[PDB]
Design a protein around this ligand. Sequence first.
Ligand code: FAD
Ligand code: FAD
Ligand code: NA
Ligand code: NA
Lengths: 327, 326
Amino acid sequence: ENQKVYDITIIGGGPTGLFTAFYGGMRQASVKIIESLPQLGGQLSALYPEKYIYDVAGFPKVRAQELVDNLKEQMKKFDPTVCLEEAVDTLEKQADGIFKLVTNKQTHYSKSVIITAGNGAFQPRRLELEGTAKYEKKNLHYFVDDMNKFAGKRVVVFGGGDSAVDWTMMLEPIAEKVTIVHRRDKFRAHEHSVENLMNSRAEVSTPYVPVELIGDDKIEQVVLQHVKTEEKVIIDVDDVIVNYGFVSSLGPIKNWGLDIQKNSILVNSKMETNIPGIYAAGDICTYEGKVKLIACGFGEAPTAVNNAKAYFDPNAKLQPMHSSSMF
Amino acid sequence: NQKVYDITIIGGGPTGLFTAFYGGMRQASVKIIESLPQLGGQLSALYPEKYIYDVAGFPKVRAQELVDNLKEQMKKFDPTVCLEEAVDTLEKQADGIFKLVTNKQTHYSKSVIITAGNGAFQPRRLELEGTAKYEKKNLHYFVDDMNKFAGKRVVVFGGGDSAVDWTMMLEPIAEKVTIVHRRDKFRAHEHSVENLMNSRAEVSTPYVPVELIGDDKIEQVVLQHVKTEEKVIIDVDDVIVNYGFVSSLGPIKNWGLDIQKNSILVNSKMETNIPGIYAAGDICTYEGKVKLIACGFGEAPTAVNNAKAYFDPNAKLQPMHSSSMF
Ligand SMILES: Cc1cc2nc3c(=O)[nH]c(=O)nc-3n(C[C@H](O)[C@H](O)[C@H](O)COP(=O)(O)OP(=O)(O)OC[C@H]3O[C@@H](n4cnc5c(N)ncnc54)[C@H](O)[C@@H]3O)c2cc1C
Ligand SMILES: Cc1cc2nc3c(=O)[nH]c(=O)nc-3n(C[C@H](O)[C@H](O)[C@H](O)COP(=O)(O)OP(=O)(O)OC[C@H]3O[C@@H](n4cnc5c(N)ncnc54)[C@H](O)[C@@H]3O)c2cc1C
Ligand code: NA
Ligand code: NA
């Protein structure tokens, strides 16, 4: 890329966007996936990677994350450009019909856009304390990418979920001290992971809620409050890590000039929105009879690709070659 | 039965199989009616050995193995499967129930989802003027149990992989088996042809059958060399044709449906022009429609859920997550 006009840009790397990316390869289009999170997989990877799915055609029983791995494998053949940690904010048609898409990182350009944004861009749930916002460019963390930057550091983890415990286990042998804070004594996690949390050098502050962060520019202390007694505890830290889960909402998608009803983008049977060049597929799209199912999003995706391919490549046919004759 | 089913499915291809599974997920009584004595549609009939690359979640899957997965997925709710039946008439009766007549029996249904592809599959027929009268006897297009040919004299017509395969299966079973093809080069796997030559199988090449002889059962077969036009005659107990499969819409065009270029026109609820009748898969069309197995997989639950809302108005269009049905 740089300055490069792609053919098909996909907003959303959930399962629908992954299969959209694959089928863009089947039609020889230059393909981009733009995804809000630093991982692909949408609801499947973020909100339930361990559940079994029973209604994808041809899988009597498949685990959610292994379906996403299958999908990433299937597309690996045409190597689409994946742009993680980017949330599309503005989307406009410029004077010559090309789309300009602006994220928090950069500008992208595209001949057609297939929005597969599901229930909207995923963000980690924000910490609800009025001071916090100023710390995000410093030592308040919602992701634990490069874990070794916490070697010999004092670190606190807010959250009582399965994901929160696991990040604690990962940090206890890395950090000088690690502490986990949750408002009830029962953690919402696996018995073996709680047992391993209990039996380690990680301090477990329950039933408390954080009530204050102290620091001029970097966080330096955290104030906790017992939920029953109202007594307080103070902790010195080098880094604070929030893990309250994920949230999603349409957000800026409602400012792109699209026809939207009950948080769904309206499409016709070509997966076309009201703006020539823009398509939608998967949980975010709707039409008469639409059913929010993964098998249905997998059918909408090649319809959108094949119709978009006919929109930007006037010398191409709507029907693709049999895949059994291409490899 | 006399039983009026909720969902009767015409066609046991990949689309119909998944349609049937999803009818179980919505707790409708479900029947599949299929022409062949096997499920799998185009996948099982026409290319059961090729690899498919563009079904979601399978980077590379063998066509017959995808069909086996689908049948596995379907056994969970045990739909009533009716093989070797081709639906010939389809009528809405006075009370709104659908009557379907096959070559075997009559069926009734509240709703019908046509997943018929390019039409009913039949074996490509032997093109000779007598023939048809022998089909109730010893002219064979299907072989359930190969051991019914033990110690019999058998001739096999065909030059394809399946013809060679049925011949190799008969070689230790039959007193004598002969295979007939109009060219010397068989259109079959080079290695399997080698086994044929090095076996007790007689290879009558390059010949064409030109006459079947017999009062009621076939008793002899007359062959003709393709270059010299000399003739050979062979005594037989059974004749087995293996020329492949053929398909056409046939009676589907006599059901009052809106049809365009061999496709049933549907809207986005998979509805045809007749309330109570739906279509999904290769046989249905609409603006932007693409003939792909994944698209048939997405059209299938659309048709089920919209049909569930049609025949059970006190039930919801959207079902909860699949993780709570197991
Ligand atoms: C607990 C649970 C169980 C479920 N079980 C089943 C089941 O058994 N069967 C079934 O069929 N369905 C099931 N579903 C629903 C299924 O997950 C959805 O049908 C499917 O995940 C939607 O896929 P998608 O790609 O359309 O959307 P998503 O999975 O939501 O992916 C959209 C992606 O786009 C990203 N994104 C959005 N906006 C932007 C933006 N502006 N810029 C960049 N990225 C953006 C999001 O962060 C996300 O990663 C379940 C859902 C849940 C929550
Ligand atoms: C060689 C070849 C390779 C292909 N490769 C691919 C590929 O890689 N990817 C892809 O997506 N698609 C591929 N396709 C297309 C794919 O096979 C079709 O999309 C798919 O088979 C459609 O499934 P279906 O169940 O809708 O129809 P079908 O598979 O045609 O099944 C319809 C069934 O209905 C039965 N039937 C019809 N009429 C009646 C009746 N009146 N009564 C009773 N039974 C009836 C038939 O006997 C048949 O079993 C290929 C097709 C061919 C021929
Ligand atoms: Na401990
Ligand atoms: Na079918």
